[PDB]
Amino acid sequence: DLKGHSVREWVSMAGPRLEIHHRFKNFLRTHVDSHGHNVFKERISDMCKENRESLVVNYEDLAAREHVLAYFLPEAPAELLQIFDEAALEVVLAMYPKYDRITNHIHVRISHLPLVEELRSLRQLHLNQLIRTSGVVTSCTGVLPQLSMVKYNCNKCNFVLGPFCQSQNQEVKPGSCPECQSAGPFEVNMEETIYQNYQRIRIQESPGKVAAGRLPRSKDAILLADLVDSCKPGDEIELTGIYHNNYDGSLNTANGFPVFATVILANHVAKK
Amino acid sequence: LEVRDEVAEKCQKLFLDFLEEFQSSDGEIKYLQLAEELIRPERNTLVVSFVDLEQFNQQLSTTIQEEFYRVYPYLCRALKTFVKDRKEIPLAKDFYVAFQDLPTRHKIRELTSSRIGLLTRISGQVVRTHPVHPELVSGTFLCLDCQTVIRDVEQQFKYTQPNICRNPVCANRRRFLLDTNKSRFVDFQKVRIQETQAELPRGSIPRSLEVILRAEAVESAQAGDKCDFTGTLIVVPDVSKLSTPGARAETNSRVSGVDGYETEGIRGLRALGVRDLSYRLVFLACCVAPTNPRFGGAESIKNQMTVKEWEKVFEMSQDKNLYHNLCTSLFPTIHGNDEVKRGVLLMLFGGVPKTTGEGTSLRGDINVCIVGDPSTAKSQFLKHVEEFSPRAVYTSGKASSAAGLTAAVVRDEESHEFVIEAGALMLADNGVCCIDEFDKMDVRDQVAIHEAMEQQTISITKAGVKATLNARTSILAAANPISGHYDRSKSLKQNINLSAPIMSRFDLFFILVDECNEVTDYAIARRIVDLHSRIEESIDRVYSLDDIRRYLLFARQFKPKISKESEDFIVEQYKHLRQRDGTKSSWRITVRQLESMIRLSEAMARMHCCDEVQPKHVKEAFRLLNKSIIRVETP
Amino acid sequence: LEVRDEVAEKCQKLFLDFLEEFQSSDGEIKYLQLAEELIRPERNTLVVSFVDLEQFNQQLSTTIQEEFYRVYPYLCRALKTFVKDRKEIPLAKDFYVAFQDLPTRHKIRELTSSRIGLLTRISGQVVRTHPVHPELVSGTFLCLDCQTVIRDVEQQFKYTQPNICRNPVCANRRRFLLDTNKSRFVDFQKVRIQETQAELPRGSIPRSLEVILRAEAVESAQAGDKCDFTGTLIVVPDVSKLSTPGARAETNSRVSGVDGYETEGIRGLRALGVRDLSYRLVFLACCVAPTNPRFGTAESIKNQMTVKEWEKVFEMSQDKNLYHNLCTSLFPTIHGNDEVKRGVLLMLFGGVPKTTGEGTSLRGDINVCIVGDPSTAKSQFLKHVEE
DNA sequence: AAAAAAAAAAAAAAAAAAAAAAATTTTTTTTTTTTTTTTTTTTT
DNA sequence: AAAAAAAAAAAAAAAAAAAAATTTTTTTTTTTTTTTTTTTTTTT
Ligand SMILES: Nc1ncnc2c1ncn2[C@@H]1O[C@H](COP(=O)(O)OP(=O)(O)O)[C@@H](O)[C@H]1O
Numbered sequence A: 001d002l003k004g005h006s007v008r009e010w011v012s013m014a015g016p017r018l019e020i021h022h023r024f025k026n027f028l029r030t031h032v033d034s035h036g037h038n039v040f041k042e043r044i045s046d047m048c049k050e051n052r053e054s055l056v057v058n059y060e061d062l063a064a065r066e067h068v069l070a071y072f073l074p075e076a077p078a079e080l081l082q083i084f085d086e087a088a089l090e091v092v093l094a095m096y097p098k099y100d101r102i103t104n105h106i107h108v109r110i111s112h113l114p115l116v117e118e119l120r121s122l123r124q125l126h127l128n129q130l131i132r133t134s135g136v137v138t139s140c141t142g143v144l145p146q147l148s149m150v151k152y153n154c155n156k157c158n159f160v161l162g163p164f165c166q167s168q169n170q171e172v173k174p175g176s177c178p179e180c181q182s183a184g185p186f187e188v189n190m191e192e193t194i195y196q197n198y199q200r201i202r203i204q205e206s207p208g209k210v211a212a213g214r215l216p217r218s219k220d221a222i223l224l225a226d227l228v229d230s231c232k233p234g235d236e237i238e239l240t241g242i243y244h245n246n247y248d249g250s251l252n253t254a255n256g257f258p259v260f261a262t263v264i265l266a267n268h269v270a271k272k
Numbered sequence B: 001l002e003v004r005d006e007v008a009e010k011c012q013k014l015f016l017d018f019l020e021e022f023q024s025s026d027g028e029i030k031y032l033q034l035a036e037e038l039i040r041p042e043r044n045t046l047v048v049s050f051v052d053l054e055q056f057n058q059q060l061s062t063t064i065q066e067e068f069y070r071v072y073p074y075l076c077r078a079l080k081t082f083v084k085d086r087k088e089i090p091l092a093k094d095f096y097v098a099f100q101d102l103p104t105r106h107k108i109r110e111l112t113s114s115r116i117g118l119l120t121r122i123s124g125q126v127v128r129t130h131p132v133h134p135e136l137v138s139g140t141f142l143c144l145d146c147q148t149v150i151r152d153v154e155q156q157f158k159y160t161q162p163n164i165c166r167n168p169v170c171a172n173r174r175r176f177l178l179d180t181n182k183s184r185f186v187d188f189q190k191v192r193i194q195e196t197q198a199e200l201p202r203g204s205i206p207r208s209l210e211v212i213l214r215a216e217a218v219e220s221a222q223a224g225d226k227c228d229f230t231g232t233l234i235v236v237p238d239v240s241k242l243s244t245p246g247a248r249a250e251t252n253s254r255v256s257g258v259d260g261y262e263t264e265g266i267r268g269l270r271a272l273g274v275r276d277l278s279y280r281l282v283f284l285a286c287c288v289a290p291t292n293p294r295f296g297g298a299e300s301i302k303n304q305m306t307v308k309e310w311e312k313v314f315e316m317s318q319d320k321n322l323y324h325n326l327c328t329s330l331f332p333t334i335h336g337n338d339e340v341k342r343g344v345l346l347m348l349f350g351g352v353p354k355t356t357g358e359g360t361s362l363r364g365d366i367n368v369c370i371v372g373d374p375s376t377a378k379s380q381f382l383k384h385v386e387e388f389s390p391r392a393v394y395t396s397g398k399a400s401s402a403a404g405l406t407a408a409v410v411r412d413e414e415s416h417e418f419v420i421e422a423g424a425l426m427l428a429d430n431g432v433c434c435i436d437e438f439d440k441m442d443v444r445d446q447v448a449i450h451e452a453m454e455q456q457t458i459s460i461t462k463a464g465v466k467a468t469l470n471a472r473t474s475i476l477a478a479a480n481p482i483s484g485h486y487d488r489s490k491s492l493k494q495n496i497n498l499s500a501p502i503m504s505r506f507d508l509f510f511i512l513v514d515e516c517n518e519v520t521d522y523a524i525a526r527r528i529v530d531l532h533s534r535i536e537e538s539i540d541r542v543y544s545l546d547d548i549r550r551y552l553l554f555a556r557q558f559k560p561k562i563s564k565e566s567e568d569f570i571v572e573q574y575k576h577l578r579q580r581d582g583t584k585s586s587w588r589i590t591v592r593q594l595e596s597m598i599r600l601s602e603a604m605a606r607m608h609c610c611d612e613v614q615p616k617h618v619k620e621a622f623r624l625l626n627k628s629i630i631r632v633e634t635p
Numbered sequence C: 001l002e003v004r005d006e007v008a009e010k011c012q013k014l015f016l017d018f019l020e021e022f023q024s025s026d027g028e029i030k031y032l033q034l035a036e037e038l039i040r041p042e043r044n045t046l047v048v049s050f051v052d053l054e055q056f057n058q059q060l061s062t063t064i065q066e067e068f069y070r071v072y073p074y075l076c077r078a079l080k081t082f083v084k085d086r087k088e089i090p091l092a093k094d095f096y097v098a099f100q101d102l103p104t105r106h107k108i109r110e111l112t113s114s115r116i117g118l119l120t121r122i123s124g125q126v127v128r129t130h131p132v133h134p135e136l137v138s139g140t141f142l143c144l145d146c147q148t149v150i151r152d153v154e155q156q157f158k159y160t161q162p163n164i165c166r167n168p169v170c171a172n173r174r175r176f177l178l179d180t181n182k183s184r185f186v187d188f189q190k191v192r193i194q195e196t197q198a199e200l201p202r203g204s205i206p207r208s209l210e211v212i213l214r215a216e217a218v219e220s221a222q223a224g225d226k227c228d229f230t231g232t233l234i235v236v237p238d239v240s241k242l243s244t245p246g247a248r249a250e251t252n253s254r255v256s257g258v259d260g261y262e263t264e265g266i267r268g269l270r271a272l273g274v275r276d277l278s279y280r281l282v283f284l285a286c287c288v289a290p291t292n293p294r295f296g297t298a299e300s301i302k303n304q305m306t307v308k309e310w311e312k313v314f315e316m317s318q319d320k321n322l323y324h325n326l327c328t329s330l331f332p333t334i335h336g337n338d339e340v341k342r343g344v345l346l347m348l349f350g351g352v353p354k355t356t357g358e359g360t361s362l363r364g365d366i367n368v369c370i371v372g373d374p375s376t377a378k379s380q381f382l383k384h385v386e387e
Numbered sequence D: 001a002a003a004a005a006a007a008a009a010a011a012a013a014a015a016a017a018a019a020a021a022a023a024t025t026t027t028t029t030t031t032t033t034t035t036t037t038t039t040t041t042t043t044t
Numbered sequence E: 001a002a003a004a005a006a007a008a009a010a011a012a013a014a015a016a017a018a019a020a021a022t023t024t025t026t027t028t029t030t031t032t033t034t035t036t037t038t039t040t041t042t043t044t
């Protein structure tokens, strides 16, 4: 349901959290097929057969069967994506409870988002929204290891400060050690940490789509944990991701307008 | 107790009245009808005409022109009232007001400090354009010593933290954390422009200044255009611009320093809050138009055509003898040289680029070369094309190192990204590049333009950025023969010193021999002396430069077919051309000449704006090539 | 999400059933009527009878007795839902339940660690009562690092901060601020009782301990009043005054100390959080009463006493020669000194104190002195009036 | 033998790594001084 | 025999003393890259 508050705050409330999580579980189990097949069963079967770690769902099917979620999706994509991670984890564990050792996580990708913006036109009005876009990869660094649930040795006493989740926005920083009570020079325990693959690509508008008097514009993009090395330089790629501003990128330094960089946490990369 | 800016609020009142009561000649409220459209997303500015301002109220117009900076947010809020009262927009959306048709005008030399903070308009050539970004305008902060949120602090073209924490018993001036979601941004592009070539003083480098483009007036400017800008001249704070101490602010509190903490040196400056005040002019473009607009606004451009220009170009197309008429209009100065006139006109119209199913990009542009004895109007033809067309870049020989010739790189001074600075080929993209002293280009860059000619594209990967820049330009080249004078007893490939692949790529080659025939000599002397005696008159361009330029822009988007009869004539005529080749011409005939002939036939169909290339066009194209290719004259 | 004290939960259910079921002899629910009386302010206490509870159900009584301190907050919550489900009263008013009529009694010396937590019934005279106070019961705190708010950290008869800041990425156990406005309180008074004369074993000083009083029982006991505290023995944290090192409570995590921060010395003790476990035994009374029930303004006494006692008082008051009758009642063993019996009796009944227009005190009570040759029952007269 | 073209050298400018540089009071403990109370020893 | 002076022991309060304590930013350095001059080498 809808109220005066914003969509993001709404979906942050626990009542609608349970509402939409239940709805996602419901159509995951019940949206059978165009022609009565229960396609999610077979998709999950192949997903666990390979241990793909990542499911993908069609936005047309999503919106058509259940449209409230589809409308909410570009507004506050991060929260919806986290909940659908949890719900997909529930359903895959239901189908194969043996999956528990397998990555303890499932990502979910959204395909065929209807409204494609163009890299020339991505303004303030798209921040913190899931957009679809096209381009060509001009650069793609190697796969690097990222912290995802990091444990820290308090190097005053070698207590293992527990596994802190690592959001993409700001680097996690423990306050103090629960044992010796010091905000000490903590340092990462290389082993108990469970890292996550991180790759950084840069897409740009294709010259076939650039206009007459122009320079093609380029947007960064971050691939994480399953999409790394899913695209090489020069690949014409569709990218779907949360156009994003609030990580630490900002020209707060001297000699600069108060002007922010941007990225795209890629949620689906599709070569063409 | 919320002191009110009396003049600014009266301006808000009077301008709101202007918005809601100024009506066009038809009688309807034009700006109500324009404010209707701000309800749409991706639209947050009205474009109010300064002449309308003047007509409705001269007092308010002069007040805005003299106090433009102070009144601007007030006019924006007036528009916010004017639109929110009628329609049910999102409450958070901001709005802007764009002025144009301003009566006065100034120059980048005239933009002196007295013009700071008040409306002013200039012309310029947009050098380069940095990427779009979100810029913070009003920030919401959190004080990290009492966790109180400080609301709605303005950014004066610099990242501004709150000057002191709003809590009285907490004097935090340092530790503030920006709450990004609560803050509001403005879309923002920084562009660099420089003095127009007309306005240069003597011995003066073209000055260049940076122009900021806030929301909705953001991608309108583009590199290479000739744009008028209108807006404020503001000052953006600079720091560490000079190695000599200058003007510095500091608090007027009379504090001293206790022993062991004495307010001296670095501690002293930090305590007093000393900070240099170094500024730099940065124009703040409120609106942007082409300085020489093409129209007052194929089917889309046709709709954009006004009725008068539409019927003008219609009767132009329907005209016969438009061929020689366009020749005369393009080159009233020139006498003779009809082959060069024809080739250059066809070059301006261009061919139809095509591409294969496999992916081979068939060329559509048609490059022309003028080679001849000295003082035969070669550079003059190139200058005519330059001064005539838009997207007509010019360069001469060894005056252009390769980086500026094709493309260069700089880092975004604001962000991490890189700006790919546009070279001559880019600025000539989808147009003409006039290269003079083409024979005297270094190998290092003649190969670069050869790559551009082969692929219509150059990919630059240098200094930390890679990109694939498109350049579909057409090259009009001037080439001096070896020895200074052409030699008709030698082949063209040994008269000039171009690389064989470059010469192959070149579509048309014209030979201009400076023979001494006195009827022609009388003609030329009479022509140029007539011009000098009667400068202003003695020109009979039957269609004005603007007329034919609009005709070119409208004609360009028609893409001819090639009908079967014309194809039969094409193949048989190329066969006849090979029979000629089989005595010998100064430059041999290959399949590339077939390619040239079909592209010129396409360009003649483009001149007549047809959707079918006919045997008339094919015959004329063959005649053009046949007369271009000359028999080497051994004694 | 959570795990419950299952026996405490079922006991709360059965205890609410007791509150709402148990009819008195008349048939109407006396505890329901007392709960109705509980509506007023300064009425946040229901005193309950173990005999009624036992007649309701045996095993309920057995578990309540055997683990009274386990279930006791759950009993108070049971009372609170019992009244709130049918009455209107401030939502933060906390209704406590105390107990009475426990059949058995214990000496003070029978305090033993086996009795901790489980309900008892002691009897020893009062020595001194301390003033009323507001005690903290469960406060809300603010972590001074991340400014996170922690709700209702229960106290254990000591000013206990929460075990760790509720933020997962925050290890604060050292820097908290009590939000005193949001914290909740209860009336509290500690009275120091001691073993009576009869219960004293040979050779011993009396055993004195500091019983606690909470809620409506905050003032029912006074100096000298030989009372009967039916509460529950309880160990409170104790002092740093013990010289013999005993019962360190320390951490199990086996964390060591690096070079420079070797865990040896005061640094190491604080790092492991090693603390002493000393204790003393204090009594948590919930409903005080007189030892011997005193007779079960003139009209105040007339109302307080029962009908049989009232008619006995009335008829003896009317009866003649009560002078001589009371003399032989109050000194049946002594012989002679009849006039002294008369005089001491008149002093016992006393006169009337009088105040003037000037306000000077004018004494009403009588003072009597006895002198005589030794062994003439002087001390016996004094002992007679004493008892 | 001298001119033109190409290759290498010299010098200025920029980007990242890693070692240096700077900031930086408040709350709790506990010894010592003082007073007070109960008792024993001594004096009237 | 009663009064009182002295002794030891216990407690309160004020002054001094005890103890606790990493993170962010800036600057040198190294290393390449690019421009333009100089030099050298090939051609007619
Ligand atoms: N046929 C002609 N018609 C008109 N002007 C001519 C003609 N031939 C030569 N000229 C004159 O010669 C001048 C120089 O010619 P130009 O093309 O600059 O020589 P070059 O080809 O060496 O650059 C021009 O300004 C032009 O006026």
Ligand SMILES: Nc1ncnc2c1ncn2[C@@H]1O[C@H](COP(=O)(O)OP(=O)(O)O)[C@@H](O)[C@H]1O
Pocket (backbone or CB within 6 Å): C333, C334, C335, C336, C337, C373, C374, C375, C376, C377, C378, C379, C380
């Ligand atoms: N006149 C009396 N009548 C009864 N009992 C007496 C009388 N005189 C002395 N006694 C007895 O003497 C006993 C001891 O007397 P006691 O209380 O020691 O007197 P005192 O303390 O004055 O010496 C008591 O048991 C008491 O009953």
Ligand SMILES: [Mg+2]
Pocket (backbone or CB within 6 Å): B378, B379, B436
């Ligand atoms: Mg020339």
Ligand SMILES: [Mg+2]
Pocket (backbone or CB within 6 Å): C378, C379
């Ligand atoms: Mg006696």
Ligand SMILES: [Zn+2]
Pocket (backbone or CB within 6 Å): A154, A155, A156, A157, A158, A159, A177, A178, A179, A180, A181, A182
């Ligand atoms: Zn630790």
Ligand SMILES: [Zn+2]
Pocket (backbone or CB within 6 Å): B143, B144, B145, B146, B147, B148, B165, B166, B167, B170, B171, B172
């Ligand atoms: Zn503050």
Ligand SMILES: [Zn+2]
Pocket (backbone or CB within 6 Å): C143, C144, C145, C146, C147, C148, C165, C166, C167, C170, C171, C172
């Ligand atoms: Zn905390």
